[PDB]
Design a protein around this nucleic acid. Sequence first.
DNA 1: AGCGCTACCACACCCC
DNA 2: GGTGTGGTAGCG
Length: 269
Amino acid sequence: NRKWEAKLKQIEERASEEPPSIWRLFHRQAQAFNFVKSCKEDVHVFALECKVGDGQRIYLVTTYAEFWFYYKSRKNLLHCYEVIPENAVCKLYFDLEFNKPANPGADGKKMVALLIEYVCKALQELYGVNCSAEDVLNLDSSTDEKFSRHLIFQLHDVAFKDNIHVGNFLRKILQPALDLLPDLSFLVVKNNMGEKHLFVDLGVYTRNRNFRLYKSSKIGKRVALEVTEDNKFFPIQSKDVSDEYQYFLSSLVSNVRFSDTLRILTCEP
DNA sequence: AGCGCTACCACACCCC
DNA sequence: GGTGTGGTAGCG
Ligand SMILES: Nc1ccn([C@H]2C[C@H](O)[C@@H](COP(=O)(O)OP(=O)(O)OP(=O)(O)O)O2)c(=O)n1
Ligand SMILES: [Ca+2]
């Protein structure tokens, strides 16, 4: 459908031996995904923010290993984002946030725990998928002004058709809470202008959504995403990779663990 | 040389 | 009111 509008941006763009390493940058997100298809190695698309104060981004294309190599030190490649590809199987993830000054009475730690408890029950009744908070990688990036956290579920042999179906899944189970714009009232939070919003950010389930990487911070601020204090997902200890690299892989929404019995979850609106 | 929508206006009809 | 446009600021 939108494939015709894709190259129309290319048409619109008319008046505008060493060791094996793949490190290709692109100024157009479309050119990035074109190279991935025309490449054999397990490669993925990253988005790096530019000095511009706005959200202008450039797009790196490389493997998870080579990326972490030049990324682990956190001296370079600051303000990076995962490009959750469209139509690509992905994990269940959450962007949770509320303004602290406008929501003092609420306790963040207790809300995230209640949300998981409810999502897990939902995952058992809809799809028969059993998981607990021990399968939820908990990331935090809060400030004094904003309670901010990312959740990435680590379901065993389970994944969603794509992130759009992840949004349909949440809009479905969170419809009772949305009505207050079973006891899901704890998800309601007041924003800056006094409006009533939902603790879950249902606006991160779009095509080619950018999602801030583990140990990355927004180009403006300086707070990077780190493993939350009360996180209870611990990857498998492996002598061939660093534990931080394990969390990095687990944090990647699109890095779905291969399996010969994978159940792909779907949800139509 | 970022990307991809929703939310929110404006106006157009349509019918008791 | 109810519903269908349809174009943009503005958000994530
Ligand atoms: N102008 C923007 C803003 C955000 N995003 C993407 C990247 C983010 O990872 C995601 C969610 O945006 P948030 O505003 O929630 O940013 P974060 O939640 O990652 O940071 P924080 O919540 O700490 O502000 O949407 C984007 O592509 N363009
Ligand atoms: Ca957020």
